[PDB]
Amino acid sequence: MFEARLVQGSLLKKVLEAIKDLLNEASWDCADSGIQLQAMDNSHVSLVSLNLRAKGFDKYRCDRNLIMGMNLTSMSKILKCAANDDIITMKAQDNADTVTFMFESPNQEKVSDYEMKLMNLDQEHLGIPETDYACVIKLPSGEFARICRDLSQFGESIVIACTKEGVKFSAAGDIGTANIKLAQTSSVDKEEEAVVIEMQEPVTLTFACRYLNMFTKATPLSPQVSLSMSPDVPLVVEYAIGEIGHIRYFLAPKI
């Protein structure tokens, strides 16, 4: 069968939040190193890619191989029934028509068990045409978040411009023009505090806003986030899921 058992249930839930509003139905691929999730959002613009590795679960086990076709909203109700010390455990038979999550408690003895129904899908693994991007920004995830939320009240679009020393976010509305600017981190300190740019040649791109705002759902997962940018190639917002893997959001520029 399949029995992936994470010590810190919270994690999975967080991940649900990071997707939930983007994708309304996903197939979790299970194999010997772990689960992997590939989907193109409701409106087919952004792309989610999720990895979760065997070594990170307290107990991993995929004998055979599973495309689990879980609907995400339903799954979100279920996780939402967990607590934050709750031991999740997805479980499934080989061609299981159902996946079971089963929550235990560390300092209690209630034992939840929710079985949800699995769906069939086609799975369109468009690759991540791997490039070495022109500019890698690392920055505080909650900073990036505060930024994205703020600048949405002006434009529908965000201009992200990096140079060797700083990154700049900019928005123009029928209301006002707005410019937020981060300089780079003197003395490479705590990542909650650290802006660090590896800068080959300057990049300046426009992105849509609702999408940044949804990618920033993933903010709790890591206190850091990392925008990799090159011209004409999509943009990668990458949150580390903290030692178990990570989630990448892919978005195309405009203009």
Author numbering: 1 to 255
What does the paper say about this structure?
In most organisms PCNA is a homotrimer, in which its three subunits adopt a doughnut-shaped structure in a head-to-tail arrangement; this toroidal structure is extremely conserved in protozoa, humans, yeast and plants. The inner face of the toroid has an array of basic residues positioned to provide favorable electrostatic interactions with the DNA-phosphate backbone.
LvPCNA eluted in a complex of approximately 90 kDa, indicating that this protein assembles as a trimer in solution. Accordingly to this previous result the molecular replacement found a trimer in the asymmetric unit. LvPCNA had the cognate fold comprised by β-α-β5-α-β-β-β-IDCL-β-α-β5-α-β-β-β topology with pseudo symmetry within each monomer. LvPCNA amino acid sequence is highly conserved among species and is structurally similar when compared with Drosophila PCNA, as it had a root mean square deviation (RSMD) of 0.5 Å for the α-carbon backbone. The central hole is highly positive charged as shown in Figure 3 and has a diameter of 30.5 Å, large enough to accommodate the double helical DNA and slide freely on it. A peptide sequence containing the WSSV DNA polymerase PIP box was modeled and docked into the crystallographic structure of shrimp PCNA, which is its natural host. This pocket comes mainly from the IDCL (G127, P129, T131), central loop (S43, H44, V45, L47) and from C-terminus (F250, L251, A252, P253, I255) residues. The results from docking suggest that WSSV polymerase has the capacity of binding the LvPCNA in the same way that most PCNA binding proteins do.
